[PDB]
Amino acid sequence: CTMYICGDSTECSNLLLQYGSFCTQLNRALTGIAVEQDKNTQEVFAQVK
Amino acid sequence: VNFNFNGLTGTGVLTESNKKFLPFQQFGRDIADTTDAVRDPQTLEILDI
Amino acid sequence: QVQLVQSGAEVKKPGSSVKVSCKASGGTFINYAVTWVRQAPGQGLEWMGGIIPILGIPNYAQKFQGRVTITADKSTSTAYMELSSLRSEDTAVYYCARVPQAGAAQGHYYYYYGMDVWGQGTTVTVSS
Amino acid sequence: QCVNLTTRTQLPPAYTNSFTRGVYYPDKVFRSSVLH
Amino acid sequence: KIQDSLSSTPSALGKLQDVVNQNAQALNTLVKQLSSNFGAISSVLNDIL
Ligand SMILES: *[C@@H]1O[C@H](CO)[C@@H](O[C@@H]2O[C@H](CO)[C@@H](O)[C@H](O)[C@H]2NC(C)=O)[C@H](O)[C@H]1NC(C)=O
């Protein structure tokens, strides 16, 4: 989020800090999707030990 | 009622407490950063909100 | 009784890097401001950078940014300056110098005196 | 009415480890059973 | 042997104790968004007013 919005600019990153925690939620949602994508395959193919 | 404790504004009900402050701390805060207790400037006693 | 001595002359080829050392004996050396000055043949003088050993953060000129590095060693009491990515225009004489009264305030430096004790000079000739 | 004192300045000081020292209360807020 | 398997392993009920953590945490981020300037000079309405 930070690098997408304000590319390596300190004065942009200091202004971005006043909006709270908007970027962390996006990172968390994307991480959750990425984690679910592996259970999707594991529940289908791994049926024999 | 409405209270103005040395710069802290708000509405609510006050009552006695059992908390103990170190002798430089003025007020207290909760998990979500909401004020919970205050100290009377003139009597140095702890009150709830 | 404060005196600073440098290393010997150097001959280099383009694209290499050089490192010059300055050893000061007879003083505290901890609260001074050690600078670096360059003089080209038949030209004037230029400012490169400086450091206060006790603090540990140097100040660099804008022109020599990303190309020079100044460090200090308190135990052996010796200051190092390293110059990389050599060109053919980096052929001059280098001087150590010392500012006795220097402060910090914020991350910058503040001087209240001029340089009084100088080094001797190290010639660095870059060619091929 | 000053008097000169220093003479023959010599060997620089020494250095020591600090471990975990130099922590102060940042503000005047009372907290209990929490990590900040 | 079902009681031993449930009691000995603490993480047996990981699916049920996973919507409680997600629901509560998403609530906290809401309340903590009441202390952001959002470009203004203060986060308190009565202070600016
Ligand atoms: C602020 O002034 C008030 C008024 O004197 C103080 O309250 C009195 O303090 C004395 C101290 O021994 C008590 O005996 C009285 O009973 C108090 N109440 C009165 C006189 O009505 C108060 O202590 C002062 N605050 C501070 C922090 O010194």
Facing residue for C27 by CB, picked from D9, D13, D15: D9
Interface residue A47 vs chain E (CB under 8 A): no
Q: How far is CA D27 from the centre of its chain?
A: 20
Quick check: helix, strand or coil at residue C44? coil
Distance CA E42, CA C89 (A): 55
Minimal Cβ distance to A19: which of E29, E32, E36:
E36
* Chains interfacing with A (3 or more CB pairs < 8 Å): E
Tokens of residue B24, six digits: 């430089």
- Does B2 lie at the interface with E, CB-CB under 8 angstroms? no
C108 near C47, Cβ under 8 Å?
Answer: no
Token pair listed for C124: 């660095």
Order of strands across the sheet that contains C3-6: C3-6, C18-25, C78-83, C68-73
According to DSSP, the residues that pair with C68 across neighbouring strands are C83
Q: Residue C110 forms beta bridges with which residues?
A: C103
3-state secondary structure chain E: CHHHHHHHCHHHHCCHHHHHHHHHHHHHHHHHHHCCCCCCCCCCHHHHC
Place of tokens 């040395």: B6
Q: Are E33 and A21 inside 8 Å of each other by CB?
A: yes
| Residue C61 CB neighbours (<10 A) | 13
Neighbors of chain C with 3 or more C-beta pairs under 8 Å: D
Q: Containing H/E element for A29?
A: helix A22-45
Look up residue A25 and give its two tokens.
Answer: 């939620």
* Numbered residues of chain D with Cβ closer than 8 Å to any chain B Cβ: 25, 28-32, 34
- The conformation of residue A1, written as its DSSP 8-state character, comes to -
Q: Is B34 within 8 Å of E31 when comparing Cβ atoms?
A: yes
Residue C19 phi/psi, 5-degree rounding, is -140, 125
- Distance between start and end Cα atoms, chain E: 66
Amino acid at A32: G
Closest residue of B to E27, CA-based? Answer: B32
Contact residues, chain B, for E25 at CB < 8 Å: none
In single-letter form, the type of residue at position E20 comes to: V
Q: Report the residue from E32, E44, E47 with minimal CB separation from B33.
A: E32
Provide the pairing of β-strand C18-25 with B2-5: unpaired
Distance from the CA of B17 to the center of ligand 1, in angstroms?
21
Helix/strand/coil for C10? strand
C-alpha to C-alpha distance for E24 and C12, rounded to whole angstroms: 67
Contact of B34 with chain E, judged by CB distance below 8 Å, is answered with yes
| CB pair distance less than 8 Å for A21 and E37 | no
Number of residues that this document lists for chain A: 49
Which residues in B3-24 are b (16+ Cβ under 10 Å) and which e?
eebeeeeeeeeeeebeeebeee
Cβ–Cβ gap D13/C27 under 8 Å: no
DSSP summary character for residue D32:
-
Q: Is C50 exposed, middle or buried (0-12, 13-18, 19+ CB in 10 A)?
A: buried
